[PDB]
C-alpha cells in the first residue's frame, strides 16, 4: 500500500492571544505522529506507537533543533514581510516529506508557502527551486548558489525520509497496515416530484483511500455524479458517498477488493 511521511512548519507573525507564533507537526499517512509549538517549546509524540518506540533522547534532541528552526522561521517571515512591504499578521509554511509507493518507487517533496499560497517548490531532479514571483526568485537565487545544501536535501528526501518512514510504518504497523472493509449501502428516494435520487454510502473503512462510482448498464455514467468528501468518523475509520439521479449499479473499490451494488 502507498504510505507517506511529512513534517510541517507553521510561522505566524503578530499572533492573537491564543495563536502560537510557531507550530511543527509530523504525519505518517493521515496520522499525527509528532507536535511542537512556541508555547510548550517541547517536541512530543502524538501517537502511542511513536512514544513507545522512540527513546527520550529522540524528543530531547529534536526539542533543541525545533527551538532553533522556530527562531529561523521568525527571521525568515520578517525578511519575507520586508520584501513584500507587508505589515500585520502573515504566515509562512514549510512541508517536507516522501512517499513509498506500492510498486517500490518513491517521491519526495519540499515546499514553502507564504500566506497559505505556493511560494517555493524544490525540484530534486534538477536541484532547482521553482519561484512563483520576483520575491521568491530572490530567495531561489541564494538557495541555488549553495550546491551542497541542494545535494543534502535530495539525499534527505530520497534516502533518510524513506528510511524514517519504513521505521515508523513498522512501529505503527497494527494501525497503519490494518484494513477495515467498508459497510456499503444504496439508498433510493423520490425527491423533487419525478426526480429519484440514488445515494451509495460507505462507512467504517480504513485506509481512507476508497474508489466509488456509478455505472449505467455496466458502462460508465455520462450524467452528473455528486461526491461526498472522505470524512473521519472519529473512531479511526472513514465515511464517503456518491449520488446520481435515476439498470444502475454502485461500484466500490477498497484495498484490493471490488464491490458492486446493483439497483
Amino acid at each position: 500500500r502507498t504510505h507517506s511521511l511529512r513534517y510541517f512548519r507553521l510561522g505566524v507573525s503578530d499572533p492573537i492571544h491564543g495563536v502560537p507564533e510557531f507550530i511543527s507537526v509530523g504525519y505518517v499517512d493521515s496520522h499525527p505522529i509528532t507536535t511542537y509549538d512556541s508555547v510548550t517549546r517541547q517536541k512530543e509524540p502524538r501517537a502511542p506507537w511513536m512514544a513507545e518506540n522512540l527513546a527520550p533522547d529522540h524528543w530531547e534532541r529534536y526539542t533543541q533543533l525545533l527551538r532553533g528552526w522556530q527562531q529561523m522561521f521568525k527571521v525568515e517571515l520578517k525578511r519575507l514581510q520586508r520584501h513584500y512591504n507587508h505589515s500585520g499578521s502573515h504566515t509562512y509554511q514549510r512541508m517536507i516529506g516522501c512517499e513509498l509507493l506500492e510498486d517500490g518507487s518513491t517521491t519526495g517533496f519540499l515546499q514553502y508557502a507564504y500566506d497559505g499560497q505556493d511560494f517555493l517548490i524544490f525540484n530534486k531532479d534538477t536541484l532547482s527551486w521553482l519561484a512563483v514571483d520576483n520575491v521568491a526568485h530572490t530567495i531561489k537565487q541564494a538557495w541555488e548558489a549553495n550546491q551542497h545544501e541542494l545535494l543534502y536535501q535530495k539525499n534527505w528526501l530520497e534516502e533518510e525520509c524513506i528510511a524514517w518512514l519504513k521505521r515508523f510504518l513498522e512501529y505503527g504497523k497494527d494501525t497503519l497496515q490494518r484494513t477495515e472493509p467498508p459497510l456499503v449501502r444504496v439508498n433510493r428516494k423520490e425527491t423533487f416530484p419525478g426526480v429519484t435520487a440514488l445515494f451509495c454510502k460507505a462507512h467504517g473503512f480504513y485506509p481512507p483511500e476508497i474508489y466509488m462510482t456509478w455505472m449505467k448498464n455496466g458502462e460508465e455514467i455520462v450524467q452528473e455524479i455528486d461526491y461526498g468528501d472522505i470524512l473521519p468518523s472519529g473512531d479511526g475509520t472513514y465515511q464517503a458517498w456518491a449520488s446520481i439521479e435515476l439498470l444502475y449499479s454502485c461500484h466500490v473499490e477498497h484495498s484490493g477488493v471490488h464491490m458492486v451494488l446493483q439497483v
Partner: antibody
Amino acid sequence: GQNIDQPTEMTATEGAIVQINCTYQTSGFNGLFWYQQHAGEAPTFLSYNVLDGLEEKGRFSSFLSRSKGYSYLLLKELQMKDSASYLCAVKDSNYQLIWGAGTKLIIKP
Amino acid sequence: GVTQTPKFQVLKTGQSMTLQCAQDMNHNSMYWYRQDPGMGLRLIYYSASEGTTDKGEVPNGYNVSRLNKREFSLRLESAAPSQTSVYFCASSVWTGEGSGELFFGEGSRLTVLE
C-alpha cells in the same frame, strides 16, 4: 550513529599522492566532512560529500560511496605544508556529528 | 570569525573557570568541544540557537550559558585534573539540520593540577 574509522597515521613522499580513507557505520547519513588540523592549530573545513562521486578543490579531492559507507580524501603533488591531521566527521540521522580520531599525515622530503 | 579566550590556563583542582567564545558571523548554533589524544572531538554542550542549550556527550563537570546570539561561555564550576584538555568553541550558520560546516575558535589549553 556509532563508529567512524580512519587510520591513525600515514606517511608518503613529497611530490607523490596519498589517499586517506574514512569508513563509517551510522544510524542514518546526512553527509561526510573532512577537516584539516595543523599541529597546535584549529581544524578548518576542507570538504563535504553527501551523494556518490568525487569533488576536487585544487590538489585535494574528496570521494564518497554511500553503499560501501566510505570516503577518501586524496591529496596530489604532496608538499611539506600538507603535514597535518585530517579529521573525518559524519552527520547521523539526528543531524549530530560523529568524529573520527583523525589521521596524522607525515611527508618524507 | 570565532574568538575564544584564554589561549592557555593553569588551574588548581577545585578552582572555577569560565571560557569565553564570541562570533560576529550571525551564526545560530554554537558548540563547545574538547580534544584529547587518540580520540575524536567530543561535544561538551551545544546551543542550537539563541535561547536554548543542551548537553553533548561529556557534560559532567561543566555548564554553559548562551548569553546572546553572539556569545556562548563554558564554565568549569570545580576544575578537576581530568578536565586537562584542548577546548574548541565552534559555530555554524544554521542548526545541525543542513550541509553547513563548523567554524572553529583558536583553541584553549587548560591544565588542571592538584
